[PDB]
Amino acid sequence: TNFIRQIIDEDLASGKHTTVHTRFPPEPNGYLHIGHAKSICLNFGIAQDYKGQCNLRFDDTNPVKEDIEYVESIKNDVEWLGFHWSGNVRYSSDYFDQLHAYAIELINKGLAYVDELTPEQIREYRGTLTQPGKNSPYRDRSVEENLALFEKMRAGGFEEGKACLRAKIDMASPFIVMRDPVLYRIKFAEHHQTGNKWCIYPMYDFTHCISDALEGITHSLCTLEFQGNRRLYDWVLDNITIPVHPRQYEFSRLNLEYTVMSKRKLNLLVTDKHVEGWDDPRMPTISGLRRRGYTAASIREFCKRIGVTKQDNTIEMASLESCIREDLNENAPRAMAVIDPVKLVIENYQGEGEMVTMPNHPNKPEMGSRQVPFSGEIWIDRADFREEANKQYKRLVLGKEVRLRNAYVIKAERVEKDAEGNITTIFCTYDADTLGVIHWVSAAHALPVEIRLYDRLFSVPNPGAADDFLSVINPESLVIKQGFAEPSLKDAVAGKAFQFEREGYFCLDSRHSTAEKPVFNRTVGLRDT
RNA sequence: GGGGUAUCGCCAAGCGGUAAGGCACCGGAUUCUGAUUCCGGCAUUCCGAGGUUCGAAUCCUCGUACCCCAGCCA
Ligand SMILES: Nc1ncnc2c1ncn2[C@@H]1O[C@H](COP(=O)(O)OP(=O)(O)OP(=O)(O)O)[C@@H](O)[C@H]1O
């Protein structure tokens, strides 16, 4: 329960409403991100919790910033999270004729006029945050005059910025938004849905409340920056012949630590090619998060945890990571892979190898097991062997013995160094009666696999508050290794999380893998305590 | 000038009857993943100072801090 559900509860109880109809209205000018996933969870969750409806509506009022590529991807990520909208996908452009009729009602009532103050002047006349504005000299044109000028606008007789339609409200209102807000502006741009049918386009505030009213939305839920806007939401509905009047309720937007959400910015990372694109595994986008190896279930959980309040806030990545870990620990089948490897040969070994039956899940016998080939000449992780180390160190020291994962208790003996003092190979003994744990991969049956170690994109917690967020990008956000994995990883499917034991949960990058060379993105590391 | 918000390091519940929960953190037990699981510790205190009350985070003053708004963006 949250403050919005308590409102919805009262409404139902008092008999204000019988059903609840919410909506998610992204503008199609970019890919959805983790913050959007919070609206999706809120809006679609309430609908299904109350057996109500939730429309997916593309708020497509600004043609020059939107593109058809985003509509298809948005529908894509909404479904992926496991949510379905009510009926058909809707578009604000679906209401362009309605919106136009409504502007006319306003004009006929004298509550709107065609102003000719330039784009620079309108700002000058608007006042400031402490100084009231002033009426444009074009404010008292006759209704008959406004209809003519508006139709001329509609007919493309005015150049961009040469005229716009404004609401005749209050230039001295303490709400900057009520200072004669623009309702329509001229843009000679092709619209991704309406082609070149329209050269005048409605502004968010005029389009949004009328669309909600037409769709019979009972509660418009948006973020806190729209609290002021709400006054205009109600003013529009109060002055046009519409039979319902939805109510807006604002909650606080999600801010994730170490990442930026501003689509303007995310777009710059993609435009300047600093990431591979919107679905780069370092991006806070839903598709990026998906390619990274997250699961819709881990995200819905994240939403459940962070809550819905009016408080500004900033979640730590630790909270997000906790979610995916919890999910993958349960459902991810374990496997073996070595990221940085140094060869290890057991001399006391007899035979061209053998087979070790390893389980697909150490805490869930029900998941089955597999035949992992064991051998004498294997591959181990460089950071697992140490010539000298204290008690704490519970791995392979040049002195004692260590257990190979589900195999034999080997025993370090000699080490063969390369010219530059680097260990090239290790020599050890073992006693076949055995069967300090480390992971390994039989060199003979090792599958060369590229591993991508992803880290946080930025090196400060609020790169948003930086003068130049770009200069604060983490150069180690992606570190590419070459390692080896047990041959079973040959059958991995894109987006199927595996837990490389003692490393983390990884998943096959569908975008870079092939036949010989598979690419694995590291979703999240283990609790490296 | 106006509109909001103030509860553990980060989220968050509480709606006059005496501070839930989660992430993180610290221990202690188990463990062929320094993982998982288990055990326990984690706000006499709710931005501050004063009021009312038997009892206030919650009600009342009176301050303080932060966030939002001046796109023909959403
Ligand atoms: N960080 C966020 N946290 C919660 N809800 C968000 C967040 N960002 C956007 N939303 C929600 O998603 C809805 C659709 O957002 P929309 O795509 O229209 O714009 P935006 O993403 O907020 O802005 P921009 O295009 O500049 O990134 C908004 O009405 C809002 O409720």
XYZ file of C-alpha atoms (C1' of nucleotides) and ligand atoms in Angstrom:
634
model
C 0.000 0.000 0.000
C 1.107 3.552 -0.684
C -0.476 6.988 -0.637
C -1.903 6.490 -4.099
C -3.539 3.168 -3.286
C -5.019 4.692 -0.157
C -6.564 7.360 -2.389
C -7.865 4.740 -4.787
C -9.247 2.789 -1.823
C -11.175 5.809 -0.530
C -12.481 6.620 -4.034
C -13.810 3.107 -4.433
C -15.212 3.028 -0.892
C -16.902 6.410 -1.067
C -18.329 5.322 -4.370
C -16.516 8.083 -6.239
C -15.495 5.475 -8.823
C -16.526 1.903 -9.482
C -13.541 1.027 -11.649
C -9.986 2.319 -11.855
C -8.437 3.237 -15.195
C -4.817 4.379 -15.257
C -2.381 4.842 -18.158
C 1.332 4.878 -19.007
C 2.102 7.644 -21.495
C 5.661 7.791 -22.685
C 6.597 10.164 -25.489
C 8.323 8.060 -28.148
C 11.626 9.975 -28.102
C 13.913 7.340 -26.672
C 14.058 3.943 -25.053
C 12.380 3.302 -21.725
C 14.614 3.141 -18.664
C 14.581 1.825 -15.095
C 12.790 4.979 -13.934
C 10.011 4.376 -16.477
C 9.776 0.816 -15.192
C 8.635 2.411 -11.956
C 5.640 4.094 -13.660
C 4.898 0.892 -15.580
C 4.874 -1.121 -12.372
C 2.722 1.505 -10.630
C 0.176 2.078 -13.377
C -0.177 -1.458 -14.675
C 0.088 -3.010 -11.202
C -2.812 -0.969 -9.801
C -4.968 -1.874 -12.800
C -4.467 -5.587 -12.316
C -4.670 -5.324 -8.531
C -8.052 -3.636 -8.810
C -9.221 -5.597 -11.843
C -9.189 -2.239 -13.663
C -7.726 -1.152 -17.007
C -4.459 0.585 -17.971
C -3.877 2.092 -21.387
C -0.554 2.326 -23.131
C -0.696 5.759 -24.732
C 2.049 7.233 -26.871
C 2.186 10.928 -25.962
C 3.255 11.933 -29.464
C 2.763 15.691 -29.610
C 6.278 16.845 -30.638
C 7.103 15.349 -34.081
C 10.657 16.685 -34.260
C 11.753 14.682 -31.243
C 9.972 11.387 -31.788
C 10.559 8.493 -34.133
C 8.800 5.274 -35.065
C 11.777 3.214 -33.822
C 10.826 4.066 -30.260
C 7.165 3.066 -30.488
C 8.009 -0.515 -31.425
C 10.679 -0.772 -28.698
C 8.482 0.744 -26.005
C 5.696 -1.791 -26.693
C 8.489 -4.357 -26.614
C 9.858 -3.487 -23.163
C 6.393 -3.098 -21.622
C 5.437 -6.604 -22.662
C 8.823 -7.957 -21.559
C 8.257 -6.692 -18.002
C 5.155 -8.853 -18.148
C 2.393 -6.282 -18.481
C -0.341 -5.851 -21.045
C -2.304 -2.737 -21.805
C -6.056 -2.381 -22.120
C -7.321 -2.689 -25.664
C -5.422 -1.074 -28.511
C -2.284 1.016 -28.208
C -3.400 4.654 -28.136
C -1.684 7.785 -29.416
C -2.268 11.452 -28.581
C -2.227 11.962 -32.346
C -5.314 9.791 -32.375
C -6.981 12.855 -30.866
C -5.628 15.583 -33.133
C -9.056 16.347 -34.576
C -10.635 16.362 -31.099
C -7.935 18.581 -29.686
C -8.495 20.955 -32.611
C -12.242 21.134 -31.976
C -11.561 21.808 -28.342
C -9.192 24.674 -29.124
C -12.099 26.140 -31.120
C -14.463 25.852 -28.152
C -11.940 27.805 -26.111
C -11.670 30.439 -28.879
C -15.448 30.667 -29.172
C -15.566 31.350 -25.439
C -12.857 34.009 -25.605
C -10.526 31.835 -23.511
C -7.870 31.560 -26.250
C -6.300 33.769 -28.887
C -3.681 33.832 -31.601
C -0.740 35.727 -30.151
C 2.012 37.074 -32.395
C 4.648 37.871 -29.806
C 7.861 36.245 -31.126
C 9.485 33.255 -29.370
C 11.890 35.625 -27.612
C 9.218 38.178 -26.628
C 6.741 35.735 -25.065
C 9.531 34.959 -22.565
C 10.076 38.689 -21.910
C 6.372 39.275 -21.265
C 5.906 36.188 -19.076
C 7.459 37.733 -15.969
C 9.914 35.872 -13.736
C 9.508 33.767 -10.584
C 8.921 36.925 -8.477
C 7.742 39.457 -11.091
C 4.330 39.008 -12.699
C 3.923 38.932 -16.466
C 2.111 41.254 -18.809
C -0.618 40.933 -21.412
C 0.476 40.603 -24.989
C -0.852 43.433 -27.142
C -2.566 40.777 -29.250
C -4.586 39.554 -26.280
C -7.939 41.168 -26.964
C -8.538 40.212 -30.563
C -12.155 39.376 -31.340
C -13.389 35.785 -31.363
C -14.070 36.280 -35.015
C -10.482 37.377 -35.474
C -9.000 34.480 -33.567
C -10.960 31.904 -35.587
C -9.554 33.412 -38.796
C -5.975 33.566 -37.535
C -6.171 30.045 -36.065
C -7.446 28.571 -39.345
C -4.638 30.443 -41.133
C -2.226 28.767 -38.707
C -3.872 25.431 -39.410
C -3.609 26.118 -43.130
C 0.133 26.817 -42.872
C -0.145 30.512 -43.598
C 2.187 31.442 -40.720
C 5.854 30.547 -40.470
C 7.212 28.627 -37.509
C 7.277 30.756 -34.399
C 5.356 33.483 -36.166
C 2.143 32.796 -34.229
C 0.746 30.459 -31.651
C -2.495 29.874 -29.775
C -2.485 30.761 -26.063
C -4.971 30.273 -23.231
C -6.367 33.588 -21.944
C -5.755 32.907 -18.241
C -3.813 35.146 -15.831
C -0.459 36.788 -16.665
C 0.009 37.627 -12.971
C -0.794 34.183 -11.613
C 1.734 32.834 -9.106
C 1.735 29.634 -11.164
C 4.036 30.359 -14.126
C 2.083 27.732 -16.082
C -1.201 29.718 -15.919
C 0.448 32.772 -17.500
C -1.302 32.311 -20.848
C 0.124 28.886 -21.689
C 0.615 28.059 -25.343
C -1.884 25.452 -26.579
C -0.702 25.140 -30.185
C 2.522 25.935 -32.026
C 3.524 25.622 -35.680
C 5.861 22.881 -36.809
C 6.184 21.986 -40.499
C 7.549 18.545 -39.680
C 6.334 15.130 -40.790
C 4.676 13.271 -37.957
C 5.391 9.566 -37.540
C 1.663 8.771 -37.467
C -0.101 11.653 -39.188
C 2.426 12.318 -41.961
C 2.041 15.871 -43.233
C -1.659 16.209 -42.385
C -0.871 18.619 -39.560
C 1.419 21.627 -39.413
C 0.182 22.842 -36.010
C 0.681 20.558 -32.982
C -0.844 20.581 -29.439
C 1.301 21.137 -26.365
C 1.605 18.554 -23.604
C -0.664 20.392 -21.123
C -3.500 20.898 -23.580
C -3.258 17.357 -25.020
C -2.838 15.413 -21.829
C -5.986 16.132 -19.831
C -8.321 15.932 -22.814
C -6.778 12.530 -23.789
C -7.252 11.239 -20.214
C -10.863 12.479 -20.143
C -11.628 10.894 -23.524
C -10.133 7.588 -22.435
C -12.029 7.684 -19.149
C -8.889 7.568 -17.022
C -9.808 7.766 -13.336
C -6.418 8.674 -11.875
C -3.549 10.232 -13.814
C -0.336 9.285 -12.075
C 2.812 11.194 -12.998
C 5.958 12.559 -11.366
C 6.431 15.477 -9.043
C 7.563 18.096 -11.599
C 3.975 18.195 -12.776
C 2.468 19.447 -9.540
C 2.298 22.967 -10.942
C 0.986 21.698 -14.272
C -2.003 20.183 -12.494
C -3.612 23.671 -12.222
C -3.665 23.856 -16.025
C -4.870 20.235 -16.196
C -7.979 21.200 -14.279
C -8.411 24.595 -15.968
C -8.627 22.937 -19.390
C -11.130 20.328 -18.282
C -13.178 22.952 -16.429
C -13.652 25.070 -19.516
C -14.525 22.660 -22.317
C -17.534 20.441 -22.834
C -16.113 17.133 -21.536
C -18.169 14.875 -19.285
C -15.534 13.509 -16.945
C -12.689 15.116 -15.056
C -9.780 12.827 -14.128
C -7.560 13.757 -11.207
C -3.753 13.913 -11.351
C -1.615 12.534 -8.517
C 2.110 13.021 -8.400
C 4.686 10.665 -6.908
C 8.491 11.105 -6.846
C 10.701 10.018 -9.730
C 13.366 7.327 -9.290
C 17.023 8.365 -9.170
C 19.595 5.612 -9.400
C 23.034 6.065 -7.933
C 25.905 6.146 -10.480
C 23.640 6.511 -13.508
C 21.860 9.235 -15.495
C 18.212 8.923 -16.653
C 17.695 12.127 -18.615
C 16.835 10.868 -22.097
C 18.592 13.982 -23.418
C 21.761 12.646 -21.811
C 21.279 8.925 -22.530
C 20.880 10.039 -26.109
C 24.232 11.854 -25.998
C 26.020 8.727 -24.770
C 24.533 6.868 -27.767
C 24.939 9.705 -30.272
C 28.582 10.268 -29.388
C 29.106 6.489 -29.493
C 30.416 6.258 -25.905
C 28.220 3.171 -25.412
C 27.223 0.750 -28.184
C 23.650 1.944 -28.198
C 20.494 2.110 -26.086
C 20.688 -1.557 -25.179
C 24.335 -1.452 -24.148
C 24.635 -3.512 -20.941
C 25.896 -0.418 -19.063
C 22.810 1.625 -19.946
C 20.048 2.020 -17.315
C 17.505 1.205 -20.030
C 15.171 -1.784 -19.787
C 16.597 -3.313 -22.971
C 20.139 -2.613 -21.810
C 19.268 -4.134 -18.438
C 17.804 -7.085 -20.323
C 20.916 -7.632 -22.465
C 22.911 -7.352 -19.255
C 21.124 -10.401 -17.921
C 18.469 -8.998 -15.606
C 15.054 -10.591 -15.435
C 11.660 -8.849 -15.647
C 10.931 -10.542 -12.345
C 13.967 -8.924 -10.678
C 12.800 -5.494 -11.887
C 9.208 -5.891 -10.770
C 10.730 -6.799 -7.408
C 12.895 -3.691 -7.437
C 9.731 -1.631 -8.009
C 8.022 -3.418 -5.126
C 10.935 -2.537 -2.831
C 11.647 1.131 -3.580
C 8.042 2.195 -2.891
C 5.938 5.161 -4.023
C 6.096 8.363 -1.993
C 6.366 12.122 -2.449
C 9.922 12.108 -1.203
C 12.833 12.935 -3.472
C 15.209 9.988 -3.194
C 18.203 8.145 -4.615
C 18.468 4.376 -4.474
C 21.873 2.709 -4.195
C 22.877 0.242 -6.937
C 23.129 -2.189 -4.022
C 19.354 -2.365 -3.846
C 19.017 -3.087 -7.564
C 21.811 -5.673 -7.516
C 20.318 -7.410 -4.495
C 17.188 -8.068 -6.569
C 18.811 -9.795 -9.562
C 21.109 -11.773 -7.309
C 18.197 -13.103 -5.276
C 16.503 -14.153 -8.527
C 19.492 -15.797 -10.170
C 20.703 -17.576 -7.056
C 17.482 -19.578 -7.125
C 17.040 -20.226 -10.803
C 20.471 -20.039 -12.345
C 22.228 -23.317 -13.103
C 25.866 -23.250 -11.980
C 28.739 -23.830 -14.388
C 32.512 -23.496 -14.583
C 34.536 -20.795 -16.289
C 37.919 -19.247 -15.700
C 38.314 -15.602 -16.659
C 42.059 -14.987 -16.166
C 43.843 -18.281 -16.564
C 47.204 -19.842 -15.702
C 47.817 -23.494 -16.656
C 48.087 -26.202 -14.004
C 49.377 -29.717 -14.761
C 48.897 -32.645 -12.408
C 51.901 -34.871 -13.083
C 50.611 -37.683 -10.877
C 47.798 -38.121 -13.446
C 47.127 -41.324 -15.402
C 44.960 -41.476 -18.501
C 43.765 -39.135 -21.255
C 41.212 -37.861 -18.743
C 38.014 -38.899 -17.002
C 34.557 -37.582 -16.145
C 33.315 -35.781 -13.074
C 29.587 -35.614 -12.411
C 28.781 -32.087 -11.334
C 25.360 -30.859 -10.169
C 23.509 -28.030 -11.944
C 22.639 -26.576 -8.555
C 24.452 -27.229 -5.211
C 21.364 -26.413 -3.156
C 18.670 -27.864 -5.397
C 19.242 -31.531 -6.318
C 16.111 -31.353 -8.486
C 17.862 -29.402 -11.231
C 19.858 -32.356 -12.541
C 23.593 -32.884 -13.076
C 26.151 -33.180 -15.859
C 29.363 -34.891 -16.936
C 32.232 -32.383 -16.673
C 35.453 -33.855 -18.078
C 38.323 -33.968 -15.564
C 41.959 -34.100 -16.609
C 45.558 -33.665 -15.484
C 46.381 -30.569 -17.495
C 43.726 -28.018 -16.519
C 43.096 -24.229 -16.396
C 42.787 -22.169 -13.230
C 42.261 -18.559 -12.301
C 45.525 -16.695 -11.815
C 44.267 -14.989 -8.665
C 43.713 -18.381 -7.039
C 47.336 -19.428 -6.709
C 49.864 -17.802 -4.395
C 53.495 -18.719 -3.656
C 53.176 -17.152 -0.203
C 50.112 -15.970 1.711
C 48.761 -15.834 5.260
C 46.164 -17.949 7.078
C 43.197 -15.930 5.802
C 43.961 -16.911 2.207
C 41.986 -20.145 1.823
C 43.003 -21.006 -1.746
C 46.064 -22.576 -3.450
C 49.368 -21.681 -1.856
C 52.712 -23.210 -2.911
C 52.560 -25.120 0.355
C 49.277 -26.872 1.194
C 46.466 -28.564 -0.758
C 43.190 -27.266 -2.227
C 40.059 -28.951 -3.500
C 39.257 -28.573 -7.180
C 35.508 -27.934 -7.590
C 33.802 -31.312 -7.336
C 37.062 -33.074 -8.235
C 40.352 -33.998 -6.550
C 42.261 -32.459 -3.621
C 45.377 -31.334 -5.465
C 48.574 -30.129 -3.798
C 50.792 -27.310 -5.069
C 54.403 -28.392 -5.553
C 56.508 -26.518 -8.095
C 55.902 -23.453 -10.260
C 57.381 -22.615 -13.666
C 57.908 -18.884 -14.194
C 58.217 -16.954 -17.429
C 61.139 -14.581 -17.966
C 59.235 -11.616 -16.512
C 58.699 -13.314 -13.153
C 55.168 -14.298 -14.167
C 53.887 -17.786 -13.400
C 53.312 -19.596 -16.695
C 52.369 -22.986 -15.329
C 51.805 -24.776 -12.069
C 52.747 -28.337 -11.078
C 50.866 -30.249 -8.392
C 50.038 -33.709 -7.022
C 46.720 -35.319 -6.073
C 45.485 -38.519 -4.466
C 42.670 -40.320 -6.289
C 41.083 -41.177 -2.935
C 39.875 -37.583 -2.565
C 36.423 -37.009 -4.140
C 40.013 -24.427 0.175
C 37.991 -24.896 -3.025
C 38.744 -23.369 -6.418
C 37.276 -23.651 -9.925
C 38.966 -25.175 -12.955
C 38.526 -26.099 -16.611
C 40.192 -29.114 -18.273
C 42.494 -27.526 -20.862
C 41.705 -30.385 -23.232
C 37.964 -29.719 -23.099
C 38.082 -25.951 -22.551
C 35.747 -23.773 -24.595
C 37.382 -20.441 -25.470
C 34.912 -17.823 -24.328
C 35.043 -14.033 -24.331
C 33.975 -12.529 -21.061
C 32.732 -8.977 -20.643
C 33.098 -7.568 -17.154
C 30.701 -4.669 -16.833
C 31.099 -2.065 -14.099
C 29.254 1.156 -13.272
C 29.164 3.644 -16.130
C 30.114 6.645 -13.992
C 32.706 7.263 -11.322
C 30.636 9.578 -9.127
C 27.268 8.788 -7.532
C 25.362 11.677 -9.122
C 26.957 12.203 -12.524
C 23.811 14.175 -13.228
C 24.950 16.965 -10.939
C 28.241 17.319 -12.826
C 29.257 20.209 -15.113
C 30.038 17.690 -17.805
C 28.793 14.220 -17.065
C 30.838 12.847 -19.977
C 34.133 13.786 -18.374
C 33.038 11.678 -15.437
C 32.523 8.414 -17.370
C 34.198 5.328 -15.844
C 36.962 4.072 -18.111
C 36.702 0.645 -16.573
C 32.929 0.368 -17.151
C 33.652 -2.552 -19.526
C 36.698 -4.808 -19.230
C 37.010 -7.545 -21.865
C 38.671 -10.842 -20.910
C 39.353 -14.066 -22.791
C 38.974 -17.217 -20.716
C 37.735 -20.793 -20.856
C 34.476 -22.487 -19.931
C 33.420 -26.103 -19.658
C 32.152 -27.338 -23.107
C 28.518 -27.432 -21.910
C 28.433 -23.639 -22.255
C 28.334 -24.539 -25.939
C 24.557 -24.878 -25.617
C 23.887 -21.571 -23.850
C 20.983 -19.498 -25.157
C 20.981 -15.738 -25.342
C 19.634 -14.354 -22.095
C 19.826 -17.452 -19.905
C 21.637 -16.604 -16.682
C 24.305 -19.061 -15.540
C 26.191 -18.705 -12.280
C 29.875 -19.109 -13.037
C 30.825 -20.469 -9.646
C 32.820 -18.117 -7.449
C 32.549 -15.368 -10.049
C 29.026 -14.175 -10.697
C 25.972 -14.603 -12.857
C 26.751 -14.337 -16.545
C 24.634 -14.570 -19.660
C 25.341 -14.947 -23.366
C 25.416 -11.575 -25.110
C 23.056 -12.211 -28.040
C 24.566 -9.266 -29.925
C 28.195 -10.447 -30.112
C 28.268 -14.235 -29.818
C 28.866 -16.657 -32.696
C 29.681 -20.361 -33.030
C 33.385 -20.640 -32.069
C 33.446 -17.541 -29.962
C 30.590 -17.075 -27.464
C 30.448 -13.758 -25.588
C 29.292 -13.662 -21.999
C 28.226 -10.492 -20.221
C 28.603 -10.505 -16.465
C 25.198 -9.577 -15.048
C 26.319 -9.105 -11.452
C 29.161 -10.310 -9.266
C 28.779 -12.450 -6.166
C 28.905 -11.104 -2.621
C 32.714 -10.838 -2.624
C 33.144 -10.604 1.144
C 6.849 34.728 -5.813
C 4.318 29.925 -5.624
C 3.901 24.583 -5.049
C 5.975 20.284 -2.464
C 9.012 17.246 1.202
C 11.292 16.462 6.037
C 11.583 8.958 10.243
C 18.534 4.573 10.733
C 24.187 4.947 5.711
C 20.173 4.319 1.336
C 14.810 3.317 0.734
C 10.253 2.958 3.873
C 5.950 1.833 7.490
C 3.316 4.674 11.212
C -2.791 8.596 10.515
C -2.562 10.214 19.880
C -1.855 4.711 22.994
C 4.647 4.804 23.722
C 9.357 3.595 16.331
C 7.346 -2.384 10.940
C 10.175 -3.967 6.973
C 14.037 -4.052 3.095
C 19.192 -2.952 1.091
C 23.800 -2.025 3.319
C 26.925 -3.016 7.807
C 28.688 -6.113 12.092
C 29.381 -10.280 14.501
C 28.290 -16.088 15.622
C 26.767 -21.279 13.464
C 26.737 -24.442 8.548
C 28.888 -25.024 3.949
C 33.307 -28.910 -1.941
C 30.867 -21.572 -4.435
C 35.463 -16.459 0.891
C 28.193 -17.666 -2.370
C 23.442 -19.557 -0.425
C 20.991 -20.866 4.267
C 20.839 -19.786 9.935
C 21.699 -16.695 14.516
C 21.900 -12.392 16.733
C 23.114 -6.574 16.567
C 21.662 -2.566 14.319
C 16.224 5.113 15.604
C 14.392 5.994 24.076
C 14.243 8.179 18.758
C 11.168 10.682 14.355
C 14.837 18.748 10.837
C 14.712 22.519 15.391
C 12.590 25.128 19.578
C 8.704 25.787 22.089
C 2.977 24.429 23.189
C -1.514 21.254 24.251
C -2.272 15.954 26.416
C -2.259 10.833 31.179
C 0.373 9.751 26.758
C 2.977 13.487 20.286
C 6.897 11.163 15.039
C 2.084 11.923 14.974
C -2.124 18.024 17.165
C -0.480 23.557 17.643
C 2.761 27.679 17.019
C 7.390 29.571 15.308
C 11.790 28.716 12.617
C 15.262 25.690 9.359
C 16.823 22.582 5.006
C 16.132 20.592 0.421
C 13.391 19.872 -4.344
C 10.156 21.890 -8.349
C 8.226 26.011 -11.820
C 10.128 31.372 -15.853
C 10.486 25.433 -23.588
C 6.286 27.897 -29.201
C 9.725 20.180 -24.560
C 7.186 16.459 -21.983
N 12.775 8.523 -13.066
C 11.469 8.268 -13.140
N 10.851 7.741 -12.063
C 9.543 7.501 -12.132
N 8.708 7.697 -13.138
C 9.354 8.210 -14.192
C 10.694 8.519 -14.273
N 11.001 9.041 -15.519
C 9.855 9.035 -16.153
N 8.820 8.536 -15.407
C 7.421 8.360 -15.772
O 7.335 7.953 -17.119
C 6.258 8.661 -17.759
C 6.617 8.810 -19.208
O 7.804 9.583 -19.323
P 8.176 10.329 -20.678
O 8.863 9.343 -21.545
O 6.968 10.995 -21.171
O 9.201 11.492 -20.233
P 10.528 11.454 -19.317
O 11.214 10.166 -19.592
O 10.147 11.810 -17.924
O 11.452 12.634 -19.880
P 12.725 12.583 -20.855
O 12.143 12.289 -22.233
O 13.415 13.945 -20.818
O 13.631 11.475 -20.330
C 6.193 9.980 -17.010
O 4.836 10.430 -16.971
C 6.562 9.608 -15.579
O 5.439 9.320 -14.775
